[PDB]
Design an enzyme around this catalytic site. Structure first.
Site, PDB file in Angstrom:
ATOM      1  N   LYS A 299       0.761  -1.212  -0.013  1.00 19.94           N
ATOM      2  CA  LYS A 299      -0.186   0.220   0.159  1.00 19.94           C
ATOM      3  C   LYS A 299       0.772   1.319   0.047  1.00 19.94           C
ATOM      4  O   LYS A 299       1.793   1.466   0.586  1.00 19.94           O
ATOM      5  CB  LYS A 299      -0.954  -0.045   1.230  1.00 19.94           C
ATOM      6  CG  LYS A 299      -1.714   1.267   1.316  1.00 19.94           C
ATOM      7  CD  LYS A 299      -2.607   1.367   2.320  1.00 19.94           C
ATOM      8  CE  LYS A 299      -4.092   2.158   1.673  1.00 19.94           C
ATOM      9  NZ  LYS A 299      -4.923   2.548   2.914  1.00 19.94           N
TER      10      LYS A 299
ATOM     11  N   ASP B 147     -13.960   0.255  16.185  1.00 18.85           N
ATOM     12  CA  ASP B 147     -14.305   0.508  14.751  1.00 18.85           C
ATOM     13  C   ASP B 147     -14.010  -0.612  13.843  1.00 18.85           C
ATOM     14  O   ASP B 147     -13.102  -0.749  12.844  1.00 18.85           O
ATOM     15  CB  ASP B 147     -13.633   1.677  14.256  1.00 18.85           C
ATOM     16  CG  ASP B 147     -14.635   2.352  12.768  1.00 18.85           C
ATOM     17  OD1 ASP B 147     -15.813   2.213  12.924  1.00 18.85           O
ATOM     18  OD2 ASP B 147     -13.903   2.698  12.009  1.00 18.85           O
TER      19      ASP B 147
ATOM     20  N   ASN C 253     -13.200  -3.643   5.986  1.00 18.90           N
ATOM     21  CA  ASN C 253     -11.716  -3.782   6.260  1.00 18.90           C
ATOM     22  C   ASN C 253     -11.783  -5.235   6.969  1.00 18.90           C
ATOM     23  O   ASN C 253     -10.564  -5.406   7.320  1.00 18.90           O
ATOM     24  CB  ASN C 253     -11.488  -2.970   7.776  1.00 18.90           C
ATOM     25  CG  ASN C 253     -11.543  -1.484   7.448  1.00 18.90           C
ATOM     26  OD1 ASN C 253     -10.663  -1.103   6.734  1.00 18.90           O
ATOM     27  ND2 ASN C 253     -12.675  -0.660   7.815  1.00 18.90           N
TER      28      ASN C 253
HETATM   29  C1  LIG Z   1      -7.731  -3.022   4.460  1.00 17.53           C
HETATM   30  C2  LIG Z   1      -6.594  -2.075   4.491  1.00 17.53           C
HETATM   31  C3  LIG Z   1      -6.359  -1.318   5.359  1.00 17.53           C
HETATM   32  C4  LIG Z   1      -5.212  -0.614   5.189  1.00 17.53           C
HETATM   33  N1  LIG Z   1      -5.321   0.375   6.325  1.00 17.53           N
HETATM   34  C5  LIG Z   1      -4.232   1.554   6.300  1.00 17.53           C
HETATM   35  O1  LIG Z   1      -3.240   1.674   5.473  1.00 17.53           O
HETATM   36  C6  LIG Z   1      -4.512   2.398   7.258  1.00 17.53           C
HETATM   37  C7  LIG Z   1      -4.896   1.650   8.629  1.00 17.53           C
HETATM   38  C8  LIG Z   1      -4.795   2.611   9.795  1.00 17.53           C
HETATM   39  C9  LIG Z   1      -4.957   4.116   9.554  1.00 17.53           C
HETATM   40  C10 LIG Z   1      -4.691   4.615   8.386  1.00 17.53           C
HETATM   41  C11 LIG Z   1      -4.725   6.189   8.307  1.00 17.53           C
HETATM   42  F1  LIG Z   1      -4.664   6.793   9.245  1.00 17.53           F
HETATM   43  F2  LIG Z   1      -3.691   6.673   7.347  1.00 17.53           F
HETATM   44  F3  LIG Z   1      -5.878   6.610   7.565  1.00 17.53           F
HETATM   45  C12 LIG Z   1      -4.447   3.619   7.217  1.00 17.53           C
HETATM   46  C13 LIG Z   1      -4.332  -0.932   4.485  1.00 17.53           C
HETATM   47  C14 LIG Z   1      -4.195  -1.816   3.225  1.00 17.53           C
HETATM   48  C15 LIG Z   1      -5.470  -2.483   3.244  1.00 17.53           C
HETATM   49  O2  LIG Z   1      -5.904  -3.525   2.534  1.00 17.53           O
HETATM   50  C16 LIG Z   1      -6.489  -3.114   1.353  1.00 17.53           C
HETATM   51  N2  LIG Z   1      -7.106  -2.059   0.964  1.00 17.53           N
HETATM   52  C17 LIG Z   1      -7.620  -1.634  -0.197  1.00 17.53           C
HETATM   53  C18 LIG Z   1      -7.872  -2.623  -1.066  1.00 17.53           C
HETATM   54  C19 LIG Z   1      -7.226  -3.842  -0.915  1.00 17.53           C
HETATM   55  C20 LIG Z   1      -6.502  -4.152   0.296  1.00 17.53           C
HETATM   56  C21 LIG Z   1      -6.042  -5.727   0.272  1.00 17.53           C
HETATM   57  C22 LIG Z   1      -4.809  -5.861   1.272  1.00 17.53           C
HETATM   58  C23 LIG Z   1      -4.214  -7.253   0.839  1.00 17.53           C
HETATM   59  N3  LIG Z   1      -4.773  -8.365   0.425  1.00 17.53           N
HETATM   60  C24 LIG Z   1      -5.985  -8.365  -0.329  1.00 17.53           C
HETATM   61  N4  LIG Z   1      -6.361  -6.933  -0.378  1.00 17.53           N
END
Ligand SMILES: Cc1cc(NC(=O)c2cccc(C(F)(F)F)c2)ccc1Oc1ncccc1-c1ccncn1
Length: 246
Positions: free
Chosen positions: A37, A131, A136
């Site tokens: 990410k 939350d 999520n």
């Molecule tokens: C679910 C999830 C949450 C975070 N969360 C944060 O990065 C985050 C956490 C806490 C706080 C914050 C703040 F504060 F910046 F807003 C951000 C990061 C990646 C995440 O996965 C995905 N997301 C969108 C599409 C797909 C996936 C995925 C991953 C692996 N395999 C299959 N799909």
């Protein structure tokens, strides 16, 4: 561990998330598949969550449960921030729900078990979420639930949090179990004002098909007063859970 973008091969996008896109990725050094990410300092800073990222990232870095999406690490560069996550193939519970419309007792009861199990784990380390929503919640290859809420929408917010300790997540399990069997969050309203009202007054009704074992467990979870909400152990021991879980 000095990690860097150059250490991964980027594949197809895995959708968008709050503050950045997630990409399928493979570690050149390990051939290992995972999720990457990308977050942008500028967007994180702008709106005040840069402190939460470190805060949760740090905490999330120490959790290890088969039902908690793992974070193998993070790093940045000048402008972006990179989180290296476990890759969950089967998508989000939220997607499966709107696809399936709702879940039967077996599926629900098994998810709640997995959820209560990760939360039990997190408790021993004084780690709460505050939350837990379906979007999520990710699914693994064996369809096992994987919480990706680097804990540390009013629809899944308890009263004390909109009007707390680890009693909050019990309320979380209460909302989820309902949404799973019924297809929608219990306090959902047409206005944001009435949702706030319904949550505070804790008012929900069950569709005729939701069974007594399910109503008991949910009715005990959705208590306005947190101390009256059962404990994770009681949940994992609940008669309805035990009879319908895989
Ligand atoms: C679910 C999830 C949450 C975070 N969360 C944060 O990065 C985050 C956490 C806490 C706080 C914050 C703040 F504060 F910046 F807003 C951000 C990061 C990646 C995440 O996965 C995905 N997301 C969108 C599409 C797909 C996936 C995925 C991953 C692996 N395999 C299959 N799909």
């Amino acid at each position: 561990r000095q990690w860097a973008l150059e250490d991964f091969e980027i594949g197809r996008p895995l959708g968008k998330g709050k503050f950045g896109n997630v990409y399928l990725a493979r570690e050149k050094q390990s051939k290992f598949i995972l999720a990457l990410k990308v977050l942008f300092k500028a967007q994180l800073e702008k709106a005040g969550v840069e402190h939460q990222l470190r805060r949760e990232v740090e905490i999330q870095s120490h959790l290890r449960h088969p039902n908690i999406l793992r974070l193998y690490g993070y790093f940045h560069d000048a402008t972006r921030v990179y989180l290296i996550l476990e890759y969950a193939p089967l998508g989000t519970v939220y997607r499966e729900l709107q696809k399936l419309s709702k879940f039967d007792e077996q599926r629900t009861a098994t998810y709640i078990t997995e959820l209560a199990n990760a939360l039990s784990y997190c408790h021993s380390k004084r780690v709460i979420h505050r939350d837990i929503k379906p979007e999520n919640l990710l699914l693994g290859s064996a369809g096992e639930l994987k919480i990706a809420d680097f804990g540390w929408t009013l629809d899944y917010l308890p009263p004390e949090m909109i009007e707390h300790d680890e009693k909050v997540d019990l309320w979380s399990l209460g909302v989820l179990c309902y949404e799973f069997l019924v297809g929608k969050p219990p306090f959902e309203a047409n206005t944001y004002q009435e949702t706030y009202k319904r949550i505070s007054r804790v008012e929900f009704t069950f569709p005729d098909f939701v069974t007594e074992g399910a109503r008991d467990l949910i009715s005990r979870l959705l208590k306005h007063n947190p101390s009256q909400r059962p404990m994770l152990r009681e949940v994992l021991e609940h008669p309805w859970i035990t009879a319908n879980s895989s």
